[PDB]
Amino acid sequence: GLVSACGIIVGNIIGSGIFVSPKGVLENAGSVGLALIVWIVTGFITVVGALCYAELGVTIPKSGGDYSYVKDIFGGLAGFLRLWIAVLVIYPTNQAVIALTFSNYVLQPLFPTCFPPESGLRLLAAICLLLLTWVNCSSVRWATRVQDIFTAGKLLALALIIIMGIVQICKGEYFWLEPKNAFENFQEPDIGLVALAFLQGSFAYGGWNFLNYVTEELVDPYKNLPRAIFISIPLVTFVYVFANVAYVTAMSPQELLASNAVAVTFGEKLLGVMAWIMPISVALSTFGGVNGSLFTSSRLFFAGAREGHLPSVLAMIHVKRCTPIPALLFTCISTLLMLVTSDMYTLINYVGFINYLFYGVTVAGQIVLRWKKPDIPRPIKINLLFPIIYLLFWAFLLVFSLWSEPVVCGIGLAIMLTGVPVYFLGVYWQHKPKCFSDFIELLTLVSQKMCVVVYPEV
Amino acid sequence: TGLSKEELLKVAGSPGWVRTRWALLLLFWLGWLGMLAGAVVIIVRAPRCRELPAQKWWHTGALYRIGDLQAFQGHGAGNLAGLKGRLDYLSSLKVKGLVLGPIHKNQKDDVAQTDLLQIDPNFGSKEDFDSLLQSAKKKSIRVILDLTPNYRGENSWFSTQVDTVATKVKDALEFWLQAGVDGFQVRDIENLKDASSFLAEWQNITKGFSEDRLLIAGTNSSDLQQILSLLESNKDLLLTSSYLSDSGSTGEHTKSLVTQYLNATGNRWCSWSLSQARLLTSFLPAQLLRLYQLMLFTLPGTPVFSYGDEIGLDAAALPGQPMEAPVMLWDESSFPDIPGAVSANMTVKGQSEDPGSLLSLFRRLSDQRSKERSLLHGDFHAFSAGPGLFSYIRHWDQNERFLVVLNFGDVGLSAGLQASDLPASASLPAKADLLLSTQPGREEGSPLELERLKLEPHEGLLLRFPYAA
Numbered sequence A: 001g002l003v004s005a006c007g008i009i010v011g012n013i014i015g016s017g018i019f020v021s022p023k024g025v026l027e028n029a030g031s032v033g034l035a036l037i038v039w040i041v042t043g044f045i046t047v048v049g050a051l052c053y054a055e056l057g058v059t060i061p062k063s064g065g066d067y068s069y070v071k072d073i074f075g076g077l078a079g080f081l082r083l084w085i086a087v088l089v090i091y092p093t094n095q096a097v098i099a100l101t102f103s104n105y106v107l108q109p110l111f112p113t114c115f116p117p118e119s120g121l122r123l124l125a126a127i128c129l130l131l132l133t134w135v136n137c138s139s140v141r142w143a144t145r146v147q148d149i150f151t152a153g154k155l156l157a158l159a160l161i162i163i164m165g166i167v168q169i170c171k172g173e174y175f176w177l178e179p180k181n182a183f184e185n186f187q188e189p190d191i192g193l194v195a196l197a198f199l200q201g202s203f204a205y206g207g208w209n210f211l212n213y214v215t216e217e218l219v220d221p222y223k224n225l226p227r228a229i230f231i232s233i234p235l236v237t238f239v240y241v242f243a244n245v246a247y248v249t250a251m252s253p254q255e256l257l258a259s260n261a262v263a264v265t266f267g268e269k270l271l272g273v274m275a276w277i278m279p280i281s282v283a284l285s286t287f288g289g290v291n292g293s294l295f296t297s298s299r300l301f302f303a304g305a306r307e308g309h310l311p312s313v314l315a316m317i318h319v320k321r322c323t324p325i326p327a328l329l330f331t332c333i334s335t336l337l338m339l340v341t342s343d344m345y346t347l348i349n350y351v352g353f354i355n356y357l358f359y360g361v362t363v364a365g366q367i368v369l370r371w372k373k374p375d376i377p378r379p380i381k382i383n384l385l386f387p388i389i390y391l392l393f394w395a396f397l398l399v400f401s402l403w404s405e406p407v408v409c410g411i412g413l414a415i416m417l418t419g420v421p422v423y424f425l426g427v428y429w430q431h432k433p434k435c436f437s438d439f440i441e442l443l444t445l446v447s448q449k450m451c452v453v454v455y456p457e458v
Numbered sequence B: 001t002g003l004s005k006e007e008l009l010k011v012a013g014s015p016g017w018v019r020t021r022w023a024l025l026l027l028f029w030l031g032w033l034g035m036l037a038g039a040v041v042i043i044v045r046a047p048r049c050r051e052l053p054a055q056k057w058w059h060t061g062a063l064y065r066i067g068d069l070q071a072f073q074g075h076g077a078g079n080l081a082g083l084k085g086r087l088d089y090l091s092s093l094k095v096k097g098l099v100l101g102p103i104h105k106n107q108k109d110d111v112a113q114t115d116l117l118q119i120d121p122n123f124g125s126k127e128d129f130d131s132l133l134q135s136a137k138k139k140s141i142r143v144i145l146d147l148t149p150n151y152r153g154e155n156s157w158f159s160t161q162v163d164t165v166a167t168k169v170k171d172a173l174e175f176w177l178q179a180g181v182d183g184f185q186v187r188d189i190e191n192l193k194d195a196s197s198f199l200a201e202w203q204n205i206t207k208g209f210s211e212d213r214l215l216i217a218g219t220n221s222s223d224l225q226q227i228l229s230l231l232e233s234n235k236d237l238l239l240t241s242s243y244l245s246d247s248g249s250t251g252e253h254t255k256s257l258v259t260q261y262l263n264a265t266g267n268r269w270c271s272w273s274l275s276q277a278r279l280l281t282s283f284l285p286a287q288l289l290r291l292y293q294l295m296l297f298t299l300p301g302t303p304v305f306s307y308g309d310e311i312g313l314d315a316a317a318l319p320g321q322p323m324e325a326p327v328m329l330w331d332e333s334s335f336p337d338i339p340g341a342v343s344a345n346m347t348v349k350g351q352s353e354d355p356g357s358l359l360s361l362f363r364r365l366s367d368q369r370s371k372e373r374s375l376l377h378g379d380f381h382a383f384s385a386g387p388g389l390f391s392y393i394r395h396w397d398q399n400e401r402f403l404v405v406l407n408f409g410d411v412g413l414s415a416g417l418q419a420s421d422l423p424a425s426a427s428l429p430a431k432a433d434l435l436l437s438t439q440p441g442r443e444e445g446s447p448l449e450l451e452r453l454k455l456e457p458h459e460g461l462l463l464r465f466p467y468a469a
Ligand SMILES: CCCCCCCCCCCCCCCCCC(=O)OC[C@H](COP(=O)(O)O)OC(=O)CCCCCCCCCCCCCCCCC
Pocket: A130, A133, A134, A136, A137, A138, A325, A329, A332, A333, A336, A450, A451, A452, B021, B024, B025, B027, B028, B031, B035
């Protein structure tokens, strides 16, 4: 029971983050040895943050994850803003970054030293996104059986980086890593640029918040769920460290920052056959990152529509194949908007700041559920000094990210404050405007006939 | 809410909606192939990457000649063993070559007692020579040993005979290459008969051993035709001459002196130097001394410096010094002959913390010569400017360009750069980011316009601008 549940958490955290972040976690920390401190502290903060979610999952047993926890504490307005950001900012931009990774990795063997066309990178990332939406709008059994072929792509690519890293350790190729003297670089970067490298290391650790409340099938929890956090997450940290020391044995740190795809500059070295096998296996890895992000994006349209928010033309399923078409067409249009624009490293920053702003609301909400309302049955109880270490690291990271990038972090707070007036015309309205309430009846019936979608039975 | 009914929908849906539901799936699928065919057209219409040339180790960085070992370290530790401790300072300079002086027990104009295979006992032996070659390889620093046979007599190359001493060097080429040296140098080859014929025979044995071995030859002739007579048969030969050792008090004298060498040699890989065994404070005053370090690090070729050129060591400043080998000013205890004679800004220790010193400008130019791709093997294109000054552009395929403006005059001359006969691949924009300057008084990182660029006397500045469409 425990050993099969640990592999569920490992396979859901490890994704396409180890192929993109390395370059942003280094260009920010300066040193090589300081960048490996970021990969261990981020793996420790994610353990602490996931034990505060495992206590809220058995205190208030809910479906929806972190969206339902902010509706039991700070119930009306703060729960809607968790939903508002997660369908406009979180899920559209997590999908646009993995799609831009796919076009960067298949266009590195062509143009190996110069720049590929920037209009052909966007066009190739819109082809990957529009194809997997068609795979998801039809036939829910197809996208489940094709995501096992994408899983073997990520495992074949990661097994080649690790065992080729220990070959060069069994050589004299440990010049930058093992010697502990190449630890000097640009120091005029602030503490505020060290806080930007924690945003980009945490992109590779994403998928821990909406994860461990589904592992219900797990046997006797209340003892097997907190034990699975202590095993599966520090093994992801061991893989992310061992794959980062293997990157600097194959190239210099000035050579890594010049590359657009690090795993294939790794493959242009160290053999002559892996100039072919590295862009194949990583592009297969990014197909499963986008396909896996289109399953779970529709689960939050389900939970929002049965609560009063998020109108009922969403969370509808087709009559023959139980697939939500208007919830998949909504998360695909907003991904195409966050594509033909922004950069790619700026986007990571953009999503990493607004993730941590709501990682701290539910963890502080776990503290006020001990002051307000004690004497409720808690089977899992963590020490009270455990979410304070998270909230101290939370406050030192949001105040130093606004100081570093004010225009990337300030436009993310503008979308959240846009959710405040639309909540009051949306939920807190008296239902007298029949001249506009029948426009919802007109749009729902047309969308219910242009596809053959219908509301579910619950 | 607005829910109809699973059973109510299928009797009101699709009377003629079944035809407009197929007209959107076909229009989706035709727009997905017109998107896929539109991305193959853009990709194959992209130009290409330009192929990177096969760079050797002396193409990437600068060389550092150490003529006298006793004067580079002080007499208290003057040996080959004491040189091993100074490899950390030379790694801070980011130099790649270690052209260290001849150590092969010359006996003052005696051909019969000059063995180029045996080290003089005042430097060490083969036991600590091999220790220097191994510890320098760890820091990626190559050792070049020079084999001028009569290096302590009045005339080199043993003027009483010609080919006994020529076969003396030929046995020493194959012996020191077995021990693992990475190059050779011969100086004063104007005192040779059949000089252009012996350099081709010696470069055979050097390149026949390996392609990563170098041979340097030095003259003192400052005229163009005597240099080209030595380089008409040899091509992979670094030739350090006194060609740039004139005054250059006007800017177009040095501009015409550089662009005539590259035009006559066909833009091959050359060496840039003021002399063959002499420092920069000769031939130059102290106010043109930072202007020449910016030029030698931004010209196409390999820059070769003597020891004491990064701190501006003047041999005529302290009295009682031989001008061929002055002492290196490491600390204030480095010249204990006359007490209190050297200052703190005249020293390695004091200039290492000063951010406006000559050693700080040397380290700030040596790191960008060694990592920027359009300075490693970029093209060169000089253009015209005002009355006297030198301006040129280094550019590679799609990397970031560089622009150097050097004022050799004495008044506050405006630049007046025109971009007329520059190639359209790397023409200059309206604004360029400043990278450094030789004199303080400019804010570094500022986009400043190139239309109105007024320049100070003895001022040289380095700009950079990206590849634009
Ligand atoms: C250059 C193009 C830029 C990209 C813009 C694309 C914008 C469209 C949003 C992306 C969504 C694409 C996924 C479509 C998936 C097909 C639905 C499906 O799964 O079929 C099973 C399903 C089969 O059901 P049955 O045949 O009734 O049994 O199809 C349907 O029932 C729904 C059919 C209509 C729904 C829309 C079909 C696609 C519309 C896109 C048309 C594109 C041009 C429209 C103008 C917009 C401007 C570009």
